[PDB]
Amino acid sequence: CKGKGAPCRKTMYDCCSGSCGRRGKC
């Protein structure tokens, strides 16, 4: 899975830890 503040795909459960949160980065 991803990691932090990388470009992330909000709806598709993109992030390894937290989530593609308000800022639209992982």
Side-chain angles (χ1 to χ4, degrees):
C1 36
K2 211 50 154 282
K4 317 314 298 175
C8 63
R9 306 187 192 86
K10 257 187 179 300
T11 39
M12 310 70 180
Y13 266 63
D14 184 275
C15 306
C16 213
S17 56
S19 30
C20 193
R22 285 74 273 159
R23 78 292 192 158
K25 325 210 282 65
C26 215

